[PDB]
């Protein structure tokens, strides 16, 4: 019965995990949280009544580059201008590089454009629920991609004397793009569990 409650516990194996991966800092405590250890930190009347303040922040270790990300659920279904533009000031108050907002189900067009517009350098990404609530990263068929600093980016275009176009592209709408949060132009090195003979390295950009 209380199925829709337990079903979100997995949104923290799809979230706090979503970090490094990237490069931010999360506690190895928040990664080994069992079924009940989750209900522990969160005090809900029942039983049921959960919600509350589901959504925290985190810091990175890459020192510079800036800045920081903010994980924030809802938990209000269907969203939603009455929860979007109103939950950005908060994002501008503690100052963050960017953050996440999840939902279920569907999101209105209106509350999708009137945002990423004055955002400037910052960014709104991206996911939702009843979708990516299980880290696909952990899949026989999914090789681990790792990001490339802009310095390393210039490497390829020399060693292989190429153009930022002549490389293997990746659609934005790719759960692994969204996952690492690729923006149009960055370049991602992936180490394929190929044969091959060997451990062959492929590279890709965004589009």
């Amino acid at each position: 019965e209380e199925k829709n409650i337990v079903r979100v516990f997995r949104a923290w194996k799809t979230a706090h995990q979503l970090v490094h991966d990237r490069g931010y800092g999360v506690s190895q405590a928040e990664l080994d949280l069992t079924l009940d250890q989750f209900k522990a930190m969160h005090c809900g009347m029942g039983r049921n009544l959960d919600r509350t303040t589901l959504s925290f922040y985190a810091k990175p270790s890459n020192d510079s580059n800036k800045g920081t990300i903010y994980i924030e659920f809802a938990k209000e279904p269907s969203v939603g201008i009455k929860e979007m533009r109103t939950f950005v000031h908060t994002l501008g108050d503690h100052n963050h590089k960017t953050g996440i907002l999840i939902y279920a189900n569907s999101m209105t067009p209106s509350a999708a454009k009137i945002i990423a517009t004055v955002t400037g350098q910052f960014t709104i990404e991206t996911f939702q629920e009843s979708d990516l609530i299980v880290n696909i990263t952990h899949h026989e068929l999914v090789p681990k991609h790792i990001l490339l600093s802009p310095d390393e980016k210039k490497e390829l275009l020399d060693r292989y004397k190429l153009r930022e176009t002549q490389l293997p592209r990746i659609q934005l709408a790719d759960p692994v793009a969204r996952y690492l949060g690729l923006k149009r132009g960055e370049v991602v090195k992936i180490v394929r569990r190929s044969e091959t003979s060997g451990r062959y390295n492929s590279y890709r950009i965004c589009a």
């Binding site: 004397k161 190429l162 002549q166 293997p168 190929s194 003979s197 060997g198």
Partner: protein, 206 residues
């Protein structure tokens, strides 16, 4: 009979249709002098010559002795020590040393550090199979080779454990296919032959 008599009437045409499909989308590709396969427009599709880097046509499925082996018997094939062992000295002939001063004792556990980082990975990459197609039949260059020179157990080795290990390191680093250095460009090469490599430390380990 009149069924496989029309099913033979098809494979006569269809088979041809599907053929042209591929061609008409792959003519584009070819291997550029850089050691990479690229599109008409230059859009590159592979960074090797086929991930391997080798010509399909010159290759012989081969076998990794060092894989489907019990750790218990693994040690009984490669590992060596001075602990109530020293059985090789019966072969060191002619010339033992004996044992000289350090160095040797040390080379023996360093060889296995890497012959061992290879036993764990794979697996961690390959399911369970062992037969895979590599370039240059090694299992054969040694026989025939024990035909050319012969010499049976009766003749012990005029070699030296400090040679076979140098032997490789000098002639794996002669197997280059991506040139050159050009630092970091030596990486694509170090592991564009990494598989072929674990063979040469498994059939030529001390």
């Amino acid at each position: 009979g009149r069924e496989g008599l029309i099913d033979t009437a098809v494979k006569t045409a269809e088979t041809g249709y599907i053929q042209r499909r591929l061609v008409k989308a792959m003519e584009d590709v070819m291997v550029r002098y850089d050691g990479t396969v690229r599109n008409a427009m230059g859009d590159i599709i592979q960074f090797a010559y086929g991930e391997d880097g080798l010509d399909a046509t010159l290759v012989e499925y081969q076998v990794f002795d060092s894989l489907r082996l019990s750790t218990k018997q693994f040690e009984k094939k490669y590992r060596i020590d001075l602990m109530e062992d020293r059985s090789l000295s019966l072969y060191m002939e002619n010339s033992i040393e004996n044992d000289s001063s350090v160095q040797d004792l040390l080379d023996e556990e360093y060889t296995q550090l890497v012959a061992d980082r290879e036993l764990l990975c794979k697996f961690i990459f390959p399911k369970g199979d062992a037969r895979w197609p590599l370039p240059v039949n090694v299992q054969r260059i040694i026989q025939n080779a024990l035909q050319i020179f012969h010499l049976e157990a009766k003749k012990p080795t005029d070699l030296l454990p400090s040679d076979i290990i140098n032997g490789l390191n000098e002639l794996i680093a002669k197997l280059t296919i991506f040139r050159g250095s050009d630092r970091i460009t030596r990486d694509v090469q170090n592991n564009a032959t990494l598989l072929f490599q674990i063979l040469l430390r498994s059939k030529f380990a001390v």
